[PDB]
């Protein structure tokens, strides 16, 4: 029952072995969700489930630098369902973010922003009831 959009500070940025967990429930008739791992105004890793892009469900990932989006990476495996509880786990690995949803691997996103210790905030937005957002080292 956290307020959305939600800003989770990531003190000292991210680092390999850091696991970020987001628990929530998708709203009925959801349109979109976004996680934005931010380095100041830049978005190192945007993770964006879209429930209706041309009547298809797709996950779009990208990076925003100096207010410009780059090349999208798209994943049609789509583990979310309107109305249902989810867990997103984002594990920082040395050369990529590794994302699992509901304990099943979903995608990896290679690091474009390389100053990992400056990726100091996670924004959580869109059509969810947000239960919790936290991090730990594994
Ligand atoms: O690349 C990734 C970006 O994509 C564009 S749309 C893109 O536009 C291109 C140019 O026309 C096309 O070339 C390309 O096909 C098409 O995907 C989105 O607006 C961006 N966004 C989403 C959101 C957001 C806000 C609130 C809640 C959830 C959210 F997700 N805030 N910003 C971002 O997701």
Per DSSP, what are the bridge partners of residue 11? none
Q: Whole-angstrom Cα distance, residue 29 to residue 66? A: 33
Range of the domain at 31: 1-138
Chain breaks in the chain (C to N over 2.5 A) after: none
Tell me the two tokens of residue 24. 């929530």
Centre of ligand 1 to C-alpha 50, Å, is 10
PDB resolution in Å = 1.0
Distance separating alpha carbons of residues 131 and 98, to the nearest angstrom: 21
Residue 110 in tokens: 């290679």
φ/ψ of residue 117, rounded to 5: -75, 5
CA 39 – CA 45 distance, rounded (Å): 9
**3 state SS of 130:** strand
What CATH number is given to the structural domain containing 129? 2.60.120.200
Distance in Å, CA 138 to ligand 1 centroid = 32
DSSP assignments along 69-84, one per residue: E---EEE------TT-
User: Which neighbouring-strand residues pair with 26?
Assistant: 128
Number of domains within the chain: 1
Tell me the C-alpha distance between 134 and 138, whole Å.
13
In the chain, how long is the greatest CA-to-CA distance?
40
Name residue 25's beta-bridge partners: 85, 129
74 annotated to a ligand binding site:
yes
N-term to C-term CA, the chain: 26
């Amino acid at each position: 029952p956290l307020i959305v959009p939600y800003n989770l500070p990531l003190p000292g940025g991210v680092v390999p072995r850091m696991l970020i967990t987001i628990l929530g429930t998708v709203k009925p008739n959801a349109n979109r969700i976004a996680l934005d791992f931010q380095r100041g105004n830049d978005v190192a890793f945007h993770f964006n489930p879209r429930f209706n892009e041309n009547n298809r469900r797709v996950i779009v990932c990208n990076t925003k630098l100096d207010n410009n989006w780059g090349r999208e990476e798209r994943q049609s495996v789509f583990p979310f369902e309107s109305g249902k509880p989810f867990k997103i786990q984002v594990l920082v690995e040395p050369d990529h973010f590794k994302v699992a949803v509901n304990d099943a691997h979903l995608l990896q996103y290679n690091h474009r922003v390389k100053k990992l210790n400056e990726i100091s905030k996670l924004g959580i937005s869109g059509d969810i009831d947000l239960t919790s957002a936290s991090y730990t080292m594994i």
